[PDB]
């Protein structure tokens with residue numbers, strides 16, 4: 001909508017207070033004009049018609065319980081935008097400042113979130129398995145990163161290309177969590193997963209097997225569920241990325257870590273320069289080797305560590 005940019009205040013899913021960029025025109029709208037062509041947050045009103053109605057609020061204060069998922073979806077979309085712009089010089093998910101749109105209160109008791117080809121969508125959870133999923137910054141960045149992937153490498157969402165697609169969203173969801181630097185970890189979804197159970201998460205990059213996901217290519221899932229295991233075999237790439245960043249010895253293979261920034265630079269370059277819709281795990285390894293070479297040199301520690309990491313998870 002046309003109006004004047006304003007700054008509201010509210011509370012997110014976890015009860016924390018934050019300021020949000022809004023737009024005033026009779027009502028205050030969850031419309032952030034400070035980033036690209038705007039960040040827009042919508043109310044799906046517990047239904048499945050998308051996007052729903054642009055979030056309107058009478059007084060620019062968002063402290064109601066119903067407001068909280070909208071506050072976080074809006075705010076964390078902006079953090080994710082800031083990450084891609086400041087760290088990778090990428091303007092929104094299409095590289096040309098496309099509007100970022102999110103709907104919250106999707107359906108009833110919906111234990112998931114997703115990118116639907118055009119926007120982000122967040123359930124409220126059922127209160128047992130999940131609380132409203134936009135409360136997790138890694139979840140929000142995970143979903144927006146799907147939009148980045150769809151505009152760049154375009155990895156098909158099945159089998160190994162789909163597992164790379166998932167891992168890329170876990171990797172950058174995690175790097176965005178670290179970028180904002182609020183209780184960062186190498187776990188996925190811990191902030192919104194199982195409120196009654198401390199210290200768990202949906203997946204682990206540091207130890208995928210903690211939740212049954214493979215941490216080596218020999219353990220890869222080869223059936224047809226989960227579009228051929230895209231959320232399962234992502235553990236193999238997630239472990240590799242974790243090793244590149246943090247180092248470790250995994251099934252006897254030692255990796256010298258090179259830190260998060262260089263992980264992000266290598267995998268962003270791989271994603272945007274070398275990966276294709278049909279890339280498989282071995283092609284990811286080559287893309288990441290070439291990216292590290294471009295950035296740091298064929299004889300660098302960085303290239304050597306990329307190689308050790310993929311060796312450690314059995315990707316040749």
Ligand SMILES: [Ca+2]
Nearest residue numbers: 057059061062
């Ligand atoms: Ca209000």
Ligand SMILES: [Ca+2]
Nearest residue numbers: 183184185190
């Ligand atoms: Ca965390």
Ligand SMILES: [Ca+2]
Nearest residue numbers: 138187188189
């Ligand atoms: Ca996390």
Ligand SMILES: [Ca+2]
Nearest residue numbers: 193194195197
């Ligand atoms: Ca939990």
Ligand SMILES: [Zn+2]
Nearest residue numbers: 142146166169
């Ligand atoms: Zn995903």
